[PDB]
């Protein structure tokens, strides 16, 4: 994977000694080239993960996330061009360095071989985002935002470290290939429950899970837009990639202690989706929407069925493209109106034709029209959960109905209706943010044509 | 300010007869019933002491409150009508014209020429009207939303632009 | 109370400004001024046929318009669907499955020439 790693780190010298105006052009073009090179990673064998090196390996689960990160990186590059114009060149290059460093840690995380190496770069993503959230934020609270996001993830991260090093002393290795191949049943000894626990809350705190999610509304609604997408699109999914990994050994414990988190989640998305319907800030809805969508994933991983894992993977990638779009969409409105209140700028279809479309299928992908990959992930979860328990259907079915309730609500309360006559600064929609939405949406329908590439290794 | 005694009955009499024609439907039937209630309205036109008319108010307003049709005829442009707030999806604020690419402005040259002088007309008018409104307003601010006239020389009516440049009721 | 000396000319002033505004909100004779339509001389070579005024001259063009509709929207389709399913789709097993027609005891099979024997006399309960 150094055919991706080496060019990615080579973006640092190139972006750090380019001209004072070419930093945006240079970073965007070669990051896209990295995305094209990363597209070759879509190739997967029947069941053998691509073992490029001793310390790097990939399969049908890592690559779709890998392409998601690499494809994403130019998207914040173009999104940040708007509000980063009024800055010095050296600080601007510092911003680009954080994004590239964030990307580089992401690729190493997904391509990691053993759990400890995965853990190091996994957590290492906290540092670049911590600077992004805090240094370049917009409001006073961002200082409290960073601490909330940092400690929450760390509070669960440290128990996993103790459990991980404990794995090495007991099993003899932490390599994922050996762990799955040398998998042994886990006893129900009272120590083993905490052993199971210490490998879980690390992944579910950043999912986020119901209860342990408050950093999500306190960061995504408050981070800079560029940091907002990568947080929602991929960073939450870091728990997903880990959980499919760590569950290979933590069996058959999952049968019992999934329950306290299952209905914690099962009552979760319905509860969270209710909060989304009754927000006042724009970005607060999508943030609360993200945990709601992430909640069905938690059930998908934990239930441990092949169908749910495919549904987990599809919903994971689909939500990333979606949540990035709505966060980008909110940023476009926030920039002109200098706020994020929902009913502040209702009724803008008459002035924003193309935006009103970009609202339209972005919300529809949030409603998950058929046959968008959102349903393909969502429906697979439903069938797996129903096979587990019939009474499941009412809950998340009601959730995706209250999900439908709000997912038109901002469409009504941002585009439908009459403009505000005192507002007179909604200028012609610039092609930059405009083309940004195009690059968000077309891969969604393109992947809809051939979804078979994003169901993970269980397909 | 407060709704005067004979003003409140005029409001109640208004929709009560609209309720009547909603009930009667037929024009002649409405005409017969409207005149009957006209004399009924005139039965105690005298009130003398205001306390009597307040009691007469209560019975009267209670009559027309129950006098509503279950589905009264709300006109298409009436509040809640079929055509009410229908074409708001077409009207766009006048400032959007300034946010036009020069090609579109050039291909509508005469209109933007007269829009420019209208934009100019807004300038001196706004200048004159604000230094007209500040002293026309007595201490304690404006006692009511009524706004003073252009009673000076060569002066435009203060606070006129959005009223004059209102989105025309038929934007098409 | 009509209006007040304040309201009277106030409404009059805004009305005339609104009146002249609506005059400016009209479309002047030179409005709109449009740019040239870049178009090959090929369609004008048959659309001046319709302007000749003869009964043939314009109905046949409408029939021609129906004809160009058929080729570029119906006729070239029926080719590429037919090319699609009878060489690529039918080349796969069970891609298209047709139900057995209701073969009659009394009727015959075309390929084998076998007439399926019919049943005997009906009750013939003529009303």
């Amino acid at each position: 994977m150094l055919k991706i790693i080496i060019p990615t780190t080579m973006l640092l010298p190139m972006t750090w000694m380019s001209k004072h105006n070419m930093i945006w052009i240079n970073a965007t073009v070669h990051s896209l080239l990295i995305s094209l090179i990363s597209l070759s990673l879509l190739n997967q064998l029947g069941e053998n993960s691509l073992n490029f090196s001793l310390t790097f390996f990939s399969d049908s689960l890592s690559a779709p996330l890998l392409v998601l990160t690499t494809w994403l990186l130019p998207l914040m590059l173009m999104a940040s061009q708007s509000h980063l114009s009024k800055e010095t060149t050296t600080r601007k290059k510092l911003y680009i360095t954080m994004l590239i460093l964030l990307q580089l840690f992401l690729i190493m995380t997904f391509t990691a071989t053993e759990l400890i190496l995965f853990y190091i770069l996994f957590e290492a993503t906290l540092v670049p985002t911590l600077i992004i959230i805090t240094r370049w934020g917009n409001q006073t609270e961002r200082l409290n935002a960073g601490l909330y996001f940092l400690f929450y993830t760390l509070a669960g991260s440290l128990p996993l470290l103790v459990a991980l090093v404990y794995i090495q002393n007991t099993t003899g290795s932490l390599n994922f290939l050996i762990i799955h191949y040398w998998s042994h049943p886990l006893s129900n000894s009272w120590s083993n429950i905490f052993m199971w626990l210490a490998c879980i809350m690390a992944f579910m705190v950043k999912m986020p899970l119901y209860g342990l999610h408050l950093w999500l509304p306190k960061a995504h609604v408050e981070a800079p837009i560029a940091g907002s997408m990568v947080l929602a699109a991929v960073l939450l999914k870091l728990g997903g990639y880990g959980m499919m990994r760590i569950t290979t050994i933590l069996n058959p414990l999952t049968n019992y202690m999934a329950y306290p988190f299952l209905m914690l989640s099962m009552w979760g998305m319905i509860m969270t989706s209710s909060i989304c319907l009754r927000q006042t800030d724009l970005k607060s809805l999508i943030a609360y929407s993200s945990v709601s969508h992430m909640a069905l994933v938690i059930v998908a991983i934990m239930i441990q069925t092949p169908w749910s894992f495919m549904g987990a993977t599809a919903l994971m990638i689909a939500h990333g493209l979606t949540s990035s779009m709505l966060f980008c969409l909110a940023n476009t409105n926030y920039e002109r109106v200098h706020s994020r209140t929902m009913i502040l700028a209702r009724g803008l279809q008459t002035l924003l034709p193309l935006m009103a479309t970009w609202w339209l299928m972005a919300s529809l992908t949030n409603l998950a029209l058929p046959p968008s990959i959102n349903l393909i992930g969502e429906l697979f979860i439903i069938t797996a959960s129903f096979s587990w328990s019939n009474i499941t259907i009412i809950l998340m079915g009601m959730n995706m109905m209250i999900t439908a309730l709000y997912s038109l609500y901002m469409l009504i309360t941002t585009q439908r209706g009459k403009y505000t006559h005192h507002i007179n600064n909604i200028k012609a929609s610039f092609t930059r943010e405009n083309a940004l939405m195009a690059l968000h949406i077309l891969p969604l329908l393109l992947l809809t044509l051939n979804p078979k590439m994003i169901l993970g290794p269980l397909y | 300010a407060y709704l005067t005694h004979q003003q409140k009955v005029l409001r109640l009499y208004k929709r009560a007869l609209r309720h009547l024609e909603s009930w009667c439907v037929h024009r002649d039937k409405y005409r017969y019933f409207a005149c009957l209630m006209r004399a009924r309205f005139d039965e105690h036109k005298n009130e003398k002491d205001m306390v009597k008319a307040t009691q007469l108010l209560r019975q009267a307003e209670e009559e027309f409150w129950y006098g509503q049709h279950p589905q009264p005829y709300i006109f298409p442009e009436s509040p809640g009508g079929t055509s009410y707030e229908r074409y708001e999806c077409y009207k766009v604020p006048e400032w959007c014209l300034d946010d036009w690419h020069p090609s579109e402005k050039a291909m509508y040259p005469d209109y933007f020429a007269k829009r420019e002088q209208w934009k100019r007309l807004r300038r001196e008018s706004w200048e004159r009207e604000v230094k007209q409104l500040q002293e026309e307003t007595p201490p304690g601010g404006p006692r009511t939303e009524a706004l003073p006239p252009a009673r000076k020389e060569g002066d435009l009516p203060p606070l006129w632009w959005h009223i004059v440049t209102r989105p025309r009721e038929r934007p098409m | 109370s009509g209006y007040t000396p304040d309201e009277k000319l106030r409404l009059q002033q805004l009305r005339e400004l609104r009146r002249r505004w609506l005059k400016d909100q009209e479309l002047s004779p030179r409005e709109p001024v449009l740019p040239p339509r870049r178009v090959w001389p090929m369609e004008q070579f048959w659309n001046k046929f319709l302007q000749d005024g003869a009964p043939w001259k314009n109905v046949i063009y409408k029939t021609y318009r129906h004809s160009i509709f058929a080729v570029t929207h119906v006729l070239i389709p029926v080719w590429i669907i037919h090319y699609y399913l009878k060489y690529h789709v039918t080349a796969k097993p069970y891609t298209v499955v047709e139900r057995k027609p209701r073969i009659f005891p009394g009727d015959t099979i075309l390929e084998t020439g076998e007439v399926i024997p019919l049943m005997k006399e009906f009750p013939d309960q003529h009303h």
Binding site: - | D99 | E26, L27
Partner: peptide
């Protein structure tokens, strides 16, 4: 006659 129709600048 023809009035004036107002629209956002769709050239972009």
């Amino acid at each position: 006659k023809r009035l004036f129709i107002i629209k956002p600048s769709g050239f972009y």
